[PDB]
Design a protein around this ligand. Structure first.
Ligand SMILES: [Co+2]
Ligand SMILES: [Mg+2]
Ligand SMILES: [Mg+2]
Lengths: 208, 208
């Protein structure tokens, strides 16, 4: 009934990013949000700690005009309260390590929509920031697109949330923080629904 | 009860590759297997067409010694009956386009274990061979590692299969074809058990 029991010791952390393009290596990271999860005594999954950052483009980063036009982010706006990739990831990693120890997990696994995209950006930024002891698994992810495909027959984030009976505000779709929260609620609903229907734990199906 | 209804028109195709390294851009593709799926009249998911190929390293490809030591593949063995990336992929795409039309789907989505690895290798090979009208979604995947995490609380392919009550022969784990077949049966069991427990169709839960 514990978080550490659910995903063979993986500590699920919901992540979303906004970027200045499609290339994790060369394009700027502009926003990152992180939501750790927790289980109550009965084994139900829910959001724990929420973090969010506007991120300053790393020195030398490319900025694709089309990307900025898509997400509407203006990196030059001095009122956007941006912090360095180091500061943002250091805080996230700190909170994540604490949660891993507190819960008895071995490692964090990124939960994200079309996870590889977000994974690649977060890892690249960690690299650039020279962050030590990255708590995240270097290639494993929990893709909510795939999960929503199974659970809800939909792979588009907004449609998946709607089908799950969730609200989804289109005007907030370009906010890493907003997407991370919706994605976290979506993921939790999927996991919890599975349990509720007697899919977990494995013994339940025989009423045990 | 139609396959085209299950994943918003996505035609799921199970794929596994064997490679000569971790870099999809620079390292050789050595094996690839493909298994299309079908749904019967009652909406149960099962393997359809099975393809498998030994693949000749592309001209200029790197071969990591450690990788060849891992998978046991000798690209220089003339008796391995290899074919070009073009031949293999052109054949897979042909079958995939055929299944998509027959079933009324829009697009193929790759099903694979830790899917982005396989996805990136297949896509790079597709580009190298200059194949037109790649039927696969350019970034969406159904990662069975994540799905097994949800359904079975296991992310390792071999363990996930065993937990699902499937046999898994370790001596065969380095064959793309073997892995693809086990992954296909795993994916089907996961989708099907979801259905049987009343998780799908969405309407089912209120009919008890
Ligand atoms: Co051979
Ligand atoms: Mg996003
Ligand atoms: Mg493999």
């Amino acid at each position: 009934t514990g978080l550490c029991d659910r995903f063979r010791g993986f500590y699920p952390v919901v992540i979303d990013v906004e970027t200045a393009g499609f290339n994790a290596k060369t394009d700027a990271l502009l926003e990152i949000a992180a939501i750790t999860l927790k289980m109550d005594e009965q084994g139900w999954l829910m959001p724990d700690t929420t973090l969010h950052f506007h991120v300053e483009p790393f020195v030398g980063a490319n900025l694709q005009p089309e990307a900025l036009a898509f997400n509407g982010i203006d990196p030059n706006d001095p009122d956007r309260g941006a912090v360095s990739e180091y500061e943002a990831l250091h805080e996230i990693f700190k909170v994540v390590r604490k949660g891993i120890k507190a819960s008895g997990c071995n490692r964090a696994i990124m939960v994200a929509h079309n996870a590889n995209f977000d994974h690649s950006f977060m890892m690249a930024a960690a690299e650039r920031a020279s962050l030590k002891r990255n708590p995240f698994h270097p290639f494993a992810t929990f893709d909510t697109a795939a999960l929503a495909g199974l659970a809800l027959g939909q792979t588009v984030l907004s449609k998946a949330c709607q089908t799950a009976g969730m609200d989804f505000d289109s005007t907030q779709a370009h906010s890493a923080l907003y997407d991370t929260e919706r994605t976290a609620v979506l993921f939790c609903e999927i996991v919890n629904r599975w349990k509720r229907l007697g899919g977990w734990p494995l013994s339940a199906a025989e009423e045990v």
